Write a protein that binds this ligand. Structure first.
Ligand code: SF4
Ligand code: SF4
Ligand code: CA
Ligand code: CA
Ligand code: CA
Ligand code: CA
Ligand code: CA
Ligand code: CL
Ligand code: CL
Ligand code: CL
Ligand code: CL
Ligand code: CL
Ligand code: CL
Ligand code: CL
Ligand code: NI
Ligand code: NI
Lengths: 694, 629
C-alpha cells in the first residue's frame, strides 16, 4: 500500500478500536457516567483544541466518535492524510478517556498514563527557556536493550525530555535507565494510544503559554509546529495504526524518524538504520542545536588566553602549515581523522605540523574557505594546553606538557576541527608530522590556494570599494577594539582580508564582520570617513570616537594582540622601526617585541605605535600620512629578507628607491640608536631628508 | 469577436497598432478566413509534380487515393513525418553551431570554458580523458565527439547517461534507436519522397527515430555545450512583459534562438566605449531585453529582462521604443521588416541561415564575435537619436520572475531537504521521495509557442494553474515559460496563491516557486534528463513514472518534433492545437492509441485546457496505481 492508504487503514483501525472501547463504557457504566482525565482544566485537550467543546459524560464521549469519522476522508491529497492522522489522535484520546472510565486508576508504575496540568506548567517553562532542548517521543521496540539504553541515555545527556511508549519501556529498564520526571525520562504506556499523553503536553502548552483558545486548531497546530521541539523515533515493525499515529505527529509539525523502510517524505518522515546516528539525525531533523559539542582535555573559550612545552611546531623552528580546501574528489571525503608522521609520544625532550582539511558539502564556495582557516586558530586555542598563532603557511603551534600528561593526541585535533566545522559551517558543509608529506603538500595545494587568494587583492585598490567591513571578534580580550578592514589595510591578525570579511557576513549575517558604508569623506591621506568613525563609536561603546585609517599619530586605529609585526616611532632618526614576533632581541627603542606589544594592543588609541600583519608593510597606505614606508629605518634581518622584493618595488613606485631593503638597518649592522643614525647618514635614507615625523 | 489575448499590456498595444494603422499576426489570421480543410486534416500532398493531390479525410466519400495511388493515411503520415524532420533540422543546426563554437574556444579568446566541472562530467559521457590535461584540449575533443553524433555513418552514437537502459533496449526492439542527426533527417526526407514508404505504421516509427536525434542529442548537446561555455544556470531574478522597456534608455531587444550572439551583445553592452556612446546620444544607459528562446537563454544565465513571447514580438515594435531589434534564426516573423518601416526601429538580421528582405543585414562574424556584437549594438545605440518620443507608449506593466532552474540547480536546491546523516547529496532522491509518497501527485512539463487559433497565453495559464492546484509540480520552457513569467506564476508567492496542499508544502521546504522555468526548448532536454534521473534512481523506465508533457498553444514544426520525442521517450503528451492528422484514421489511431503499446506513452489532443488538466491527473493516477504509489 502507498503512504496514503496505509494511513487511512490505520485511522479506520483506530476508529474501530475507539468504537469497541466506548461500547464497553456504555454497556458497563451507562451514557451518563462522568468522563474526565486526572487534574486537568481542558477536559479532553485534543477534542478541546479541535472543537473547543468539553467532554463531560460517556454519552458526549460517544458523540466525539463522529469527530474521528469526519477527519477520515479517503482522498489522496496531503491535507486529507494529515486530517486522517488527527483522526487517529482523537481516536487515541477517546480510547484513553474510556480507560479512565472503566477503571479509576488504569495506569500503575512504571507507566504514568495521563500527565496532569501541574506537570505541564512545571515542564513548560524550561521548554520555553530552552533548558529542555527537545522532546524525544521514542515508540516501538529496539533490536536489543543495549541499543535502547544507548539512545535514551544519550537523549537524556543533552537535557531532552524522553517519553517512552511500547516495548521500549521494558528495554530501558533492562538496560538500566534511570526513569523519572526529574530524570527527564517518562514511560507513558505500553499501548500505542498512550502516545496521545505527550501530544496533550504539546497542545496544552499552546493553550497555557501560547494563550490560544479552544477551537483555534490551525493556531494550535502552528504553535506546536513552531514552538514545541518534539519528534518521534519509531523503532521495530510499524503497523498501519502506528503509521497513522505518525501522521498525527506530522500534523502537529513533529518529524517522524524510523529504522524501518517507509515512503520517506523530506523533513517529515525519515528512515535511519544506523542506531549510532539516530540521535544526531533526530536533533538535526527538528533543528535542535545542543550547546555542548571527543578529547579528554577541557575545551572552552576560557583557554583562549593561553610551564614548558612537550612539542613545538612552526614559527622559526620547523615548517608547519594549515590549509582548508573545498573539493568533491581527489581523496576520501569523510570524517577521516588521519595522522601521517612521527607521533608526539616519540618525543623524549622539549617537528612540523601539517593541517590539510577537506570539505565538499553543498553550498560551499571556493572563496568561502579563508573564513575557515581563521576559525581553526580559535578551535585550536580552546584546547587546554595548546596555543595557535600565525596565519596559513607561517603558522606557530606549541603543545603543552599537561596535554601530554592528559594523553591528548593529534587525533583529537582532527576531531575538534571536523566537529566544530559541522557545528558552525553546518549550512555550507589530515595531520602530517612527516617532513616529506609536509613539504610536497605545502606547495601542492596550500601555496597555490594562497597565491590565488592573495592574487585577488594583489592588484586591487581601495580606489573602487563602496563599503568597508568592521570586525569585533578580538573584543573578547580588547573590549574597545573595532578592527576596520580595507583591500589595503588588513585585519591586524593578518588573516581576515577585506574579502574574507565579506564572506563572513554572507555566512553569518549577524557575525563579527559587518558592513560599514564609505560615506562622508573628510581626508584621503589620513583616512577619515564620518560613517567609519560612527560605526566604531557604537561597537567600542563610546570609548573610541575619532579615528584615522592611514595614520599612527593622529587618532590611530586601536590594536588588539594578534599582530605579527609592530611599528614604533623613532623621532631621533625622523622615522619608525619594525619588529616581528619571531625576534627575541632588543630594538633601537630599547624594547623587545613583548614590551612593544604591551604598548600597542589592549584596544586603546596609542599614538606613535601600531600593530599590523606582514602584508601591510608593502602597502602604499602604510603610514602614508607620515611619508609611507620611506620612514622604515630599522627592521630585523629575517623580516627584511622575507619582504625584500615586495618593498623594493613599492618603494620605487614612490621614492624610486631601488634598494630600500639595503638602506634599512638591522641587528647585524647595529641596534643602538646612535649607531643606527650613523648608518642612515652614510647610506642616505629618505627619512632623514623627509619632513619632521612629529 | 473572440479576445485576442489575456495579457493587458498586449491588449493595450493591440489598440495602438490599430490607431497607428499597422498589421499584426491577429489581423493576418483573420484575413486567412476559413483556412483550407485538406491542409488542416493533412490530406493534401505536394511531394511530386504529378500533383497537387487532395484525398477525402472522410472515409468512403470523395477521392480515395492520390495520382501515385497513395491512400489518405500515407499522405497524412508523410506530411506528419516531414514536420518532425524539419523540427529536428532546426534544433540540429542550433546545437551544431554550439559544438563548432566549443571547438574554437581559447584561454585568451572570446569564447571560453566557463563551467569546467560540467565539461569534465560531459567528457565522461563521450569517453574523453580529463586527467592532467588542458581544459581547452578536453573541450576540443568533447566538441569533436559531439560533432560525430551529427554525421557518423559507421559506429554507434553517444547518448547521455540519464537515459535508462530499459528505454534504450525498448527503442532497439522497436527499431527506432537513433542514428546520426543529419542522417536521420535524410532518411525521413527520402522515405517521404514519391514512390517510397506507403505504410502509416512504418512512417510514424521513422519519424519517432528521427525525433530522438533531437531530444537526446542535438537539443541535449546544445544545452550541455552552452552551459559549458556560457555557464550552467542557477536561481536568478528577472522581470517579464513589455513593461520592461524603458522610455529614456536605449532599448535593444534580442529575438531569435542562437545563444552566442545574445551572449556577446550582453558582454558588448558593458564595453566602456558603448556605455559612453549611449550617454552621447542622450540616454540613461543600455536597456537589454530578450524575446522567445534567445531571451530565455540570456535571462537564465544573466537575468536579462524578458520583453515578451512569440505573438508579442510585433507589439514590442508598436511601443515605438525599440531602437534596435537584433535577430538570428527561428520564429522571427518576416512581418517585422514591413512593420519596422512604420517606426524608427532598426530591424537587424545577423544570420546567413535567416536573411529577411528589407531588413538591415549585419552578419555576425563567428571568428571575431565580441567585435562583431559591438559593431551591431553600436548601430542600435546610434538609432536612439531617431526616436520620436511623442509616439512612444510602453504599457506600465511588468512582472517579477525567478528562473535558472537547471537540473544541477534543482538538485542543489533539493539538498536543503536532505538530512546530513541519511539521504545522499547531489541526487534527485528528494523529488522521487515526494512523488512516491504521494505529496506531489506527479510532474508535468508545459512547453510550447503561441497560436492565433488559441487566445494568447490563455491555454498556457489555465493549464499550468490547474496542474499546480492538483498538487502536480510544473516545469516550463520557451514561450510557455515566458507566459507564466508575465502572469506571475514564476514567483515564490505563487505557491500559497495557486498551488495545492502538497505542492505548497514542498515549495515552502525547498524554497521554490510552484512553476520552475528550465530554459528554452533546446532546454527541454533538461526535462528529459530530470525525468530520466528519477527513473534510474527508482530502477524503472520513464513510461512507469506519473509524468506528462503539454503543448497548449504550439505552432512550430519544432513543437511536433518535441512532442514526438517526448512520447517516444515514454512521456504522455497533450496537444492544445490539433495537428494535421484528422484525415488519416490509421495515423490518428497510431498517435493516440497504438503508440502506448510501442513506447508506453501516447498523444492526447485536447483544445479545452480544463478538460486536459482532468485527463492528465487521471492518467497520472492510472500510472501511479500500476506502480503501487
Ligand atoms: S585582528 Fe581584526 S580582522 Fe583579525 S580577528 Fe581580530 S578584529 Fe578580526
Ligand atoms: S505523392 Fe502522390 S498524391 Fe502526392 S502529389 Fe505525388 S502523386 Fe500526387
Ligand atoms: Ca488541581
Ligand atoms: Ca473533497
Ligand atoms: Ca540482556
Ligand atoms: Ca523487534
Ligand atoms: Ca551530462
Ligand atoms: Cl524542571
Ligand atoms: Cl520540523
Ligand atoms: Cl482588437
Ligand atoms: Cl504594417
Ligand atoms: Cl518611434
Ligand atoms: Cl540522481
Ligand atoms: Cl486569469
Ligand atoms: Ni591582536
Ligand atoms: Ni586581533
Amino acid at each position: 500500500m502507498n503512504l496514503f492508504q496505509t494511513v487511512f487503514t490505520g485511522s479506520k483501525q483506530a476508529l474501530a478500536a475507539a468504537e469497541g472501547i466506548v461500547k464497553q463504557a456504555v454497556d458497563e457504566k451507562g451514557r451518563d457516567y462522568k468522563v474526565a482525565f486526572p487534574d486537568t482544566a481542558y477536559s479532553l485537550p485534543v477534542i478541546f483544541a479541535a472543537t473547543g467543546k468539553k467532554i463531560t459524560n460517556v454519552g458526549e464521549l460517544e458523540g466525539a466518535l463522529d469527530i474521528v469519522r469526519s477527519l477520515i476522508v479517503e482522498e489522496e491529497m496531503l491535507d486529507k492524510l494529515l486530517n486522517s492522522g488527527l483522526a487517529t489522535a482523537v481516536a487515541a484520546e477517546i480510547i484513553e478517556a474510556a480507560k479512565y472510565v472503566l477503571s479509576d486508576a488504569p495506569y500503575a508504575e512504571p507507566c504514568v498514563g495521563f500527565i496532569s496540568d501541574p506537570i505541564i506548567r512545571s515542564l513548560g517553562v524550561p521548554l520555553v527557556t530552552g533548558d529542555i532542548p527537545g522532546v524525544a517521543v521514542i515508540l516501538g521496540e529496539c533490536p536489543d536493550s543495549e541499543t535502547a539504553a544507548k539512545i535514551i541515555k544519550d537523549y537524556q545527556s543533552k537535557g531532552l525530555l524522553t517519553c517512552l511508549v511500547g516495548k521500549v519501556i521494558d528495554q530501558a529498564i533492562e538496560g538500566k535507565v534511570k526513569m523519572g520526571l526529574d530524570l527527564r525520562v517518562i514511560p507513558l504506556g505500553y499501548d500505542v494510544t498512550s502516545v496521545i499523553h505527550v501530544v496533550t503536553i504539546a497542545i496544552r502548552a499552546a493553550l497555557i503559554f501560547g494563550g490560544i483558545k479552544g477551537g483555534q486548531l490551525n493556531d494550535i497546530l502552528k504553535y506546536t509546529a513552531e514552538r514545541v521541539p518534539a519528534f518521534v523515533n519509531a523503532f521495530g515493525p510499524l503497523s498501519e495504526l502506528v503509521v497513522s499515529a505518525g501522521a498525527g505527529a506530522i500534523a502537529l509539525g513533529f518529524p517522524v524518524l524510523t529504522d524501518q523502510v517507509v515512503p520517506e517524505v523530506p523533513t517529515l518522515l525519515l528512515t535511519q538504520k544506523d542506531y549510532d546516528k539516530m540521535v544526531k539525525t533526530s536533533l538535526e531533523a527538528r533543528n535542535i542545536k545542543i550547546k555542548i559539542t571527543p578529547i579528554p582535555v577541557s575545551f572552552a573559550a576560557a583557554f583562549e588566553g593561553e610551564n614548558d612545552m612537550l612539542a613545538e611546531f612552526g614559527g622559526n623552528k620547523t615548517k608547519a602549515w594549515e590549509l582548508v580546501m573545498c573539493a568533491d574528489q581527489g581523496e576520501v571525503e569523510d570524517h577521516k581523522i588521519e595522522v601521517i608522521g612521527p607521533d608526539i609520544d616519540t618525543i623524549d625532550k622539549a617537528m612540523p605540523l601539517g593541517m590539510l582539511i577537506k570539505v565538499s558539502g553543498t553550498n560551499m564556495q571556493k572563496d568561502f574557505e579563508p573564513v575557515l582557516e581563521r576559525r581553526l586558530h580559535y578551535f585550536l586555542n580552546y584546547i587546554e594546553g595548546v596555543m595557535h598563532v600565525g596565519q596559513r603557511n607561517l603558522t606557530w603551534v606549541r603543545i603543552g606538557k599537561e596535554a601530554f600528561e592528559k594523553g591528548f593526541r593529534l587525533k583529537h585535533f582532527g576531531e575538534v576541527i571536523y566537529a566544530k566545522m559541522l557545528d558552525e559551517f553546518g549550512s555550507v558543509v589530515t595531520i602530517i608530522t612527516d617532513p616529506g608529506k609536509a613539504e610536497e603538500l605545502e606547495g601542492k595545494y596550500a601555496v597555490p590556494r594562497y597565491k590565488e587568494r592573495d592574487a585577488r587583492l594583489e592588484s586591487l585598490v581601495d580606489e573602487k570599494v563602496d563599503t568597508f567591513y568592521s570586525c569585533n571578534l578580538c573584543q573578547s580580550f580588547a573590549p574597545a577594539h573595532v578592527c576596520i578592514v580595507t583591500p589595503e589595510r588588513l585585519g591586524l591578525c593578518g588573516a581576515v582580508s577585506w574579502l574574507d570579511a565579506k564572506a563572513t557576513l554572507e555566512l553569518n549575517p549577524t557575525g563579527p564582520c559587518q558592513a560599514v558604508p564609505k560615506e562622508g569623506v573628510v581626508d584621503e591621506n589620513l583616512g577619515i570617513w564620518e560613517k567609519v568613525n560612527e560605526t566604531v563609536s557604537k561597537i567600542s561603546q563610546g570609548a573610541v570616537t575619532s579615528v584615522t585609517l592611514y595614520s599612527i599619530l593622529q587618532d590611530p586605529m586601536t590594536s588588539c594582540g594578534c599582530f605579527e609585526c609592530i611599528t614604533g616611532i623613532m623621532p631621533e632618526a625622523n622615522g619608525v622601526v619594525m619588529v616581528n614576533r619571531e625576534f627575541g632581541a632588543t630594538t633601537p627603542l630599547g624594547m623587545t617585541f613583548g614590551e612593544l606589544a604591551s604598548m600597542t594592543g589592549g584596544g586603546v588609541q596609542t599614538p606613535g605605535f601600531m600593530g599590523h600583519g606582514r602584508q601591510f608593510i608593502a602597502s602604499k597606505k602604510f603610514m602614508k600620512g607620515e611619508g609611507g614606508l620611506g620612514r622604515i629605518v630599522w627592521m630585523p634581518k629575517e623580516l627584511k629578507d622575507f619582504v625584500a622584493e615586495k618593498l623594493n618595488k613599492t618603494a620605487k613606485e614612490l621614492y624610486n628607491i631601488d634598494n630600500f631593503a639595503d638602506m634599512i638597518c638591522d641587528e647585524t649592522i647595529a641596534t643602538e640608536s646612535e649607531e643606527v643614525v650613523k648608518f642612515l647618514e652614510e647610506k642616505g635614507h629618505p627619512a632623514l631628508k623627509m619632513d619632521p615625523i612629529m | 469577436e473572440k479576445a485576442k489575448s489575456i495579457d493587458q499590456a498586449t491588449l493595450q498595444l493591440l489598440d495602438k497598432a490599430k490607431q497607428d494603422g499597422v498589421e499584426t499576426v491577429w489581423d493576418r489570421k483573420a484575413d486567412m478566413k476559413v483556412q483550407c480543410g485538406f491542409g488542416s486534416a493533412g490530406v493534401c500532398c505536394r511531394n511530386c509534380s504529378m500533383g497537387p493531390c487532395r484525398v477525402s479525410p472522410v472515409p468512403g466519400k470523395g477521392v480515395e487515393r492520390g495520382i501515385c495511388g497513395a491512400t489518405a493515411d500515407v499522405i497524412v503520415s508523410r506530411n506528419f513525418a516531414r514536420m518532425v524532420a524539419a523540427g529536428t533540422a532546426a534544433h540540429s543546426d542550433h546545437g551544431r553551431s554550439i559544438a563548432l563554437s566549443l571547438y574554437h574556444t581559447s584561454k585568451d579568446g572570446d569564447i571560453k570554458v566557463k563551467d569546467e566541472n560540467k565539461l569534465k562530467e560531459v567528457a565522461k559521457s563521450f569517453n574523453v580523458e580529463t586527467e592532467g590535461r588542458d581544459i581547452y584540449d578536453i573541450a576540443h575533443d568533447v566538441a569533436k565527439e559531439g560533432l560525430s553524433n551529427y554525421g557518423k555513418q559507421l559506429g554507434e552514437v553517444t547518448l547521455p547517461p540519464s537515459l535508462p537502459e530499459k528505454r534504450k533496449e525498448l527503442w532497439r526492439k522497436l527499431g527506432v534507436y537513433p542514428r546520426a542527426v543529419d542522417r536521420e533527417i535524410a532518411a525521413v526526407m527520402h522515405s517521404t519522397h514519391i514512390g517510397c514508404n506507403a505504410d502509416a505504421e512504418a512512417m510514424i516509427k521513422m519519424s519517432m527515430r528521427c525525433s530522438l536525434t533531437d531530444g537526446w542529442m542535438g537539443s541535449f548537446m546544445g544545452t550541455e555545450f552552452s552551459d559549458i561555455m556560457f555557464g550552467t544556470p542557477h536561481s536568478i531574478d528577472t522581470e517579464a512583459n513589455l513593461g520592461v522597456l524603458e522610455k529614456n534608455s536605449v532599448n535593444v531587444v534580442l529575438h531569435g534562438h542562437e545563444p552566442l550572439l545574445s551572449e556577446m551583445v550582453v558582454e558588448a553592452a558593458s564595453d566602456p566605449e558603448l556605455v559612453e556612446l549611449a550617454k552621447s546620444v542622450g540616454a540613461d544607459g543600455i536597456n537589454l531585453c530578450g524575446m522567445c528562446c534567445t531571451g530565455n537563454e540570456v535571462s537564465m544565465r544573466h537575468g536579462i529582462k524578458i520583453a515578451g513571447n512569440f505573438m508579442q514580438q510585433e507589439l514590442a515594435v508598436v511601443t515605438g521604443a525599440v531602437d534596435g531589434l537584433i535577430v538570428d534564426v527561428q520564429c522571427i516573423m518576416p512581418a517585422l521588416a514591413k512593420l519596422s518601416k512604420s517606426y524608427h526601429t532598426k530591424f537587424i538580421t545577423t544570420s546567413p541561415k535567416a536573411h529577411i528582405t528589407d531588413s538591415i543585414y549585419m552578419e555576425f562574424d563567428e571568428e571575431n564575435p565580441l567585435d562583431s556584437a559591438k559593431k551591431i549594438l553600436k548601430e542600435a545605440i546610434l538609432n536612439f537619436k531617431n526616436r520620436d518620443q511623442s509616439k512612444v507608449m510602453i504599457p506600465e506593466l511588468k512582472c517579477k520572475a525567478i528562473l535558472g532552474y537547471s537540473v544541477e540547480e534543482i538538485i542543489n536546491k533539493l539538498d536543503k531537504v536532505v538530512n546530513t546523516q541519511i539521504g545522499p547529496m547531489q541526487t534527485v532522491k528528494p523529488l522521487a521521495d515526494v512523488l512516491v509518497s504521494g505529496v506531489l501527485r506527479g510532474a508535468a512539463a508545459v512547453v510550447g509557442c503561441n497560436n492565433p487559433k488559441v487566445v494568447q497565453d490563455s491555454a498556457h495559464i489555465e493549464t499550468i494553474k490547474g496542474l499546480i492546484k492538483n498538487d502536480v509540480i510544473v516545469v516550463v520552457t520557451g514561450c510557455a515559460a515566458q507566459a507564466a513569467a508575465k502572469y506571475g506564476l514564476l514567483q515564490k508567492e505563487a505557491a500559497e496563491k495557486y498551488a495545492g496542499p502538497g505542492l505548497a508544502t514542498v515549495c515552502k521546504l525547498v524554497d521554490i516557486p510552484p512553476v520552475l522555468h528550465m530554459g528554452s526548448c533546446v532546454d527541454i532536454s533538461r526535462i528529459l534528463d530530470l525525468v530520466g534521473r528519477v527513473a534510474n534512481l527508482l530502477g524503472v523506465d520513464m513510461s512507469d513514472l506519473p509524468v506528462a508533457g503539454v503543448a497548449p498553444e504550439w505552432m512550430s514544426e519544432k513543437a511536433v518534433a518535441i512532442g514526438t520525442y517526448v512520447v517516444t521517450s515514454g512521456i504522455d503528451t497533450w496537444l492544445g492545437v490539433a495537428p494535421p492528422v484528422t484525415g488519416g484514421p490509421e495515423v490518428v489511431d497510431i498517435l493516440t492509441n497504438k503508440m502506448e503499446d510501442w513506447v508506453g506513452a501516447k498523444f492526447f489532443i485536447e483544445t479545452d485546457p480544463h478538460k486536459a488538466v482532468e485527463q492528465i491527473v487521471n492518467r497520472m493516477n492510472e500510472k501511479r496505481k500500476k506502480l503501487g504509489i
